Ligand binder design. Structure first.
Ligand code: ADP
Ligand code: MG
Lengths: 66, 456, 177, 109
């Protein structure tokens, strides 16, 4: 709306996250939910710390189930 | 306009379009880059459509642009489709290059109106004793081969194709729905080697293909048959398994947001079946004669899918696992099979009395079987001992060597005419063969070959 | 569920507090600013991060708005964030005006004429519409070149159509039925 | 660090921890005012973990502090266990005093 409200946002420190990277949100029974993997293809392989690998199966709207 | 993939889950894909450019129900969409087609099944709201992939989704991602085609799947129709193998989208799946189409029709259509239906009772001879006797088929009628797994649905259909399609002067459509890819190859080489491939259109959607492909293959084959019927021609339509159409709907129904009904089936089982089955009919322009194979889950004829199918057919042929387990083929149950043609006004009083006479003897034998098992055969009346001997002869005289089954039996095939069938069963019921052993009637053909077999 | 169903409790809470403290215009401005800010692409993204806590997301939305939210509206924003409902602010803002309109006894009418805009025409229709609805009317006239001649009046779910295109529709169904 | 019981439903308890101190799956946790042991089953997000109580939950309430032990349930092993009765957590239940353990092993391998 106003030039003031249009401002402030550049000092909000939102930055960005690469389309090929995401972050783990929850871990249950061998299923991991990830936020941010925008370029994932169904059945593609995901790399986690420690050399653990996963396979993307649910490409839902705001979360990837691996 | 253009849309973006927003949600991929198995074979189901959601595509979001501008709220002023939402594609219609059943409309075809194309993914940019990837070679994949999506059909709109539901309009969720806010410019989003729910669609099913007509291919694989392993290469699909969120955010891929999707294009609206403005229409439903359009497949090629007419003379250019004869002697060709095609997929659900109508693409050629043979190496013979492109098809010279002069028109494309949409797979979705209304059923012919109540005023367009036509009634005919022309008797169609098949050459099989059990069918020609208890299940007489009619030209322009609907036939169903009901049976479980491993009882003869494909084999029997191939024999009919051979005893009818090869002689049939008109064209023919063969649709392999959820079939084994090996059966499709054997049949293609068989039609090609027999020189009959020139008058048969082949559409294949086997078990290795995505649910959406197996859900629309039947509409593609039927759309080609409807173009020929509407030209005023007489057509034959053979469907390998129409159950795979219902199953593809069950596999995708839950992901489409539908609550399940009884026996874990889609709540739209009877309407999805009626919408397909009402188009396979003979109108006042041309006549479609159709043979469908109907799979029976776990051999249970009361299962919702088989149970909803009987009302759509004129001739119902039932194959029994208990008869096949005794090495008797065709494994047709003469007490569960029925036809609208089994009427004295249509087939004559002699044929009708012979068929009812055979059924009466077999029903009486079915209730004497337990007596014979516990007490034994000597504790029966003289009339019952004679009836049990004739029932066992009739049960073996219904077996027949087939030309398409020589690789399985080693024995040459036989074609029996309707006159010969009636004579052979009338003779056994009358008592003209009460001296020959029951083994003489097993796998022979006409009644003379039983007389020759008995001596040896 | 429908966003309207999820936003109904929050919109009604804002309205019943605003009415009891003579703030029906302050909350109107605050809810409108909150809706706008939350819809911005940079703010949209910030509000969907797994690293930030509910309080951190709530605070960030208050700092961008500033003076536009009074103490009570600031507490309401925190309550919506604590419950994880910050994606419903545009809907909460819409439903608040509807409750207020029934209270002030007013309607925002959407008149659409065939090529005409005139004070003589507006005041001639607005008295009859006000009398029929038993409410004050805030006309929002516009142009609809599609119409051969006449006007379509939309008020709530009521739709009074006096356009020649409507007469053509009636004439067309009558022949085929 | 220390978490707070946020939810209790029968034998299952949810505990919230600071985002930089969330316990790993199967890590053992102890409630401060009762010393009841909990085993982490899954991580739900927002620093919240779900656990199963290794005892009765009667008398527990929301807001109680919980301590993470940094390891799974560990029990005594070797010759010292012969002729002794123990519970699920490796405590002696035969009234014969403490177990003369030289080492302990985690129960997940
Ligand atoms: N008429 C027949 N004569 C001999 N064997 C037969 C006959 N019909 C079926 N069989 C046996 O069963 C198989 C045919 O089953 P098939 O027709 O594929 O059944 P379905 O389609 O019902 O699964 C053959 O391989 C053979 O072993
Ligand atoms: Mg088969």
């Amino acid at each position: 709306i106003s030039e003031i409200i249009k401002g402030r946002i550049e000092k909000l420190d939102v930055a960005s996250q690469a389309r090929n990277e995401g972050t783990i949100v929850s871990v249950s029974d061998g299923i991991v939910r990830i936020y941010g993997l925008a370029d994932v293809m169904y059945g593609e392989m995901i790399e986690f710390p420690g050399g653990v690998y996963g396979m993307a199966l649910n490409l839902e709207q705001d979360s990837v189930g691996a | 306009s253009s849309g973006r993939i927003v949600q991929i889950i198995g074979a189901v894909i959601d595509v979001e379009f501008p709220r002023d450019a939402v594609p219609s129900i059943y409309e075809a969409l194309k993914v940019q880059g990837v070679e994949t087609t999506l059909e709109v099944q539901q309009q969720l709201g806010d410019g989003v459509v729910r669609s099913i992939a007509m291919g694989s989704t392993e290469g699909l991602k969120r955010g891929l642009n999707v294009d609206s085609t403005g229409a439903a799947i359009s497949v090629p129709v007419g003379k250019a489709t004869l002697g060709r193998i095609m997929d659900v989208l109508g693409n050629p799946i043979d190496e013979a290059g492109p098809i010279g189409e002069e028109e494309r029709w949409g797979i979705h259509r209304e059923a012919p109106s109540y005023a367009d239906q036509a009634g005919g009772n022309e008797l169609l001879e098949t050459g099989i004793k059990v069918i020609d006797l208890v299940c007489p088929f009619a030209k322009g009628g609907k036939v169903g081969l009901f049976g479980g797994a491993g009882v003869g649905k494909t084999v029997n259909m191939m024999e009919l194709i051979r005893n009818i399609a090869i002689e049939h002067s008109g064209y023919s459509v063969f649709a392999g729905v959820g079939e084994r890819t090996r059966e499709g190859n054997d049949f293609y080489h068989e039609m090609k080697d027999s020189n009959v491939l020139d008058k048969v259109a082949l559409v294949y959607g086997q078990m290795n293909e995505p649910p959406g492909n197996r859900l629309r293959v039947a509409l593609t084959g039927l759309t080609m048959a409807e173009k020929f019927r509407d030209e005023g021609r007489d057509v034959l339509l053979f469907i390998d398994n129409i159950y795979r159409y219902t199953l593809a709907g069950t596999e995708v129904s839950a992901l489409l947001g539908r609550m399940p009904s009884a026996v874990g089936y889609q709540p739209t089982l009877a309407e999805e079946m009626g919408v397909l089955q009402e188009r396979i009919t003979s109108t006042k322009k041309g006549s479609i004669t159709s043979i469908q194979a109907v799979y029976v889950p776990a051999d249970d004829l009361t299962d919702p899918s088989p149970a909803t199918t009987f009302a759509h057919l004129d001739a119902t042929v039932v194959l029994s696992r208990d008869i096949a387990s005794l090495g008797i083929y065709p494994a047709v149950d003469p007490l569960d099979s029925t036809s609208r043609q089994l009427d004295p006004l249509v087939i004559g009083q002699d044929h009708y009395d012979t068929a009812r006479g055979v059924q009466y003897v077999l029903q009486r034998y079915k209730e004497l079987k337990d007596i014979i098992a516990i007490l034994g055969m000597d504790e029966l009346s003289e009339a019952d001992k004679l009836l049990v001997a004739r029932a066992r002869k009739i049960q073996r005289f219904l077996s027949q060597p087939f030309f398409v089954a020589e690789v399985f039996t080693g024995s040459p095939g036989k074609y029996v005419s309707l006159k010969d069938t009636i004579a052979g069963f009338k003779g056994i019921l009358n008592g003209d063969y009460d001296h020959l052993p029951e083994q003489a009637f097993y796998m022979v053909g006409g009644i003379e070959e039983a007389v020759e077999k008995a001596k040896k | 569920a429908e966003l309207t169903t999820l936003a109904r409790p929050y919109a009604k809470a804002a309205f019943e507090y605003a009415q009891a403290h003579q703030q029906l215009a302050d909350w109107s401005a605050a809810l409108g600013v909150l809706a706008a800010v939350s819809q911005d692409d940079t703010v949209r993204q910030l509000l969907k991060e797994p690293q930030l806590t509910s309080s951190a997301k709530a605070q960030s939305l208050i700092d961008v708005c500033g003076d536009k939210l009074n103490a009570p509206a600031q507490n309401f924003v925190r309550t919506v964030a604590e419950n994880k409902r910050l994606e419903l602010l545009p809907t909460i803002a819409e439903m608040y005006e509807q409750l207020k309109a029934e209270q002030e006894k007013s309607v925002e009418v959407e008149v659409t004429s065939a090529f005409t805009l005139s004070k003589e025409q507006q005041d001639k229709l607005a008295k009859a519409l006000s009398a029929r609805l038993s409410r004050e009317v805030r006309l929002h006239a516009s142009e609809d070149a599609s119409l051969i001649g006449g006007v379509i009046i939309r008020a709530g779910d009521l739709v009074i159509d006096g356009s020649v295109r409507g007469k053509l529709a009636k004439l067309a169904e009558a022949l085929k039925s």
